[PDB]
């Protein structure tokens, strides 16, 4: 989980780092939360 | 000619092995024969000369 | 519509000479039979809208022949209004 901000405010920039962090975790989880696939064996 | 709905023997070679209709793809009849057939096969279903299912 | 023995009957009075069907006043009279036949059907069947533009089209083909018939002889037009009842 990487993210970068090139702001100078080291309190307002982390308001955007946590925004980019929270987006990337949801990409990771919905990648692996497609276990729910109805596959009935023969 | 014209299919009469009482002539069962020529009309029941076109019914299925359960009571369905064979398509003209597998039977091989023409277009206007098939739909002149199907208005006679369904008047014969109504007066119990042929079943709906067996 | 109307039967042929009804249709061949109505082309006897308004015929101009023998074997002249297709004349304007012999194909307005058979329209007025077909006008009056279908709006009696349409009177008891008020929901039949697809048969209504069949009526409204042959109203238009009767009007275009009445407007045609005045343009070459007016005295024949006055006789057809009196023979079978139309307004205008």
């Amino acid at each position: 989980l990487r993210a970068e901000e090139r702001n100078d405010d080291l309190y307002a920039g982390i308001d955007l780092i946590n925004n980019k962090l929270e987006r990337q975790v949801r990409k990771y989880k919905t990648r692996i939360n497609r276990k729910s696939r109805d596959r009935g064996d023969q | 000619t014209h299919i009469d709905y009482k002539d069962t023997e020529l009309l029941k070679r076109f019914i299925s092995e359960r009571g369905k209709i064979l398509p003209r793809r597998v039977t091989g009849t023409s277009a206007k024969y098939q739909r002149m057939l199907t208005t006679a096969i369904k008047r014969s279903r109504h007066m119990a000369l042929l079943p709906y299912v067996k | 519509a109307i039967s042929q023995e009804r249709k061949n009957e109505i082309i006897k009075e308004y015929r101009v000479h023998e074997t002249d069907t297709g004349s304007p006043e012999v194909q307005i009279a058979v329209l007025t039979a077909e006008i009056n036949a279908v709006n009696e059907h349409l009177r008891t069947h008020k929901k039949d809208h697809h048969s209504r533009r069949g009526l409204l089209k042959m109203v238009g083909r009767r009007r275009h022949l009445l407007n045609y018939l005045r343009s070459k002889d007016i005295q024949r037009y006055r006789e057809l209004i009196k023979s079978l009842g139309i307004r205008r």
Partner: protein
């Protein structure tokens, strides 16, 4: 001017002159208002293909009518539903 071909089915569990009493009311109905029956052919017992009013057999009838009114055969449609013997019925115009 119009050629009709009715076909009506009666119960199997009826006896002889009960059967021929019911066919002779209808051929008077199918002669009413200028109907003038061509002929009244009768099929025999047929093993009919399924189970209507939990019966197994039926006695068929074929009556051909030449009318121009449709006054006789809809009268037939009115009464054949009323009677509990005549189990199905179908008129069809042939052109």
């Amino acid at each position: 001017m119009r050629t009709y071909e009715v076909m009506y089915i009666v119960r199997p569990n009826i006896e002889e002159d009960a059967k021929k009493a019911l066919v002779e009311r209808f051929n008077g109905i199918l002669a009413t208002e200028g109907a003038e029956v061509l002929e009244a052919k009768d099929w025999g017992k047929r093993r009919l293909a399924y189970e209507i009013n939990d019966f197994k057999d039926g006695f068929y009838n074929i009556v051909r009518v030449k009318s121009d009114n449709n006054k006789a055969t809809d009268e037939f449609q009115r009464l054949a539903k009323i009677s509990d013997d005549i189990i199905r019925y179908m008129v069809i115009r042939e052109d």
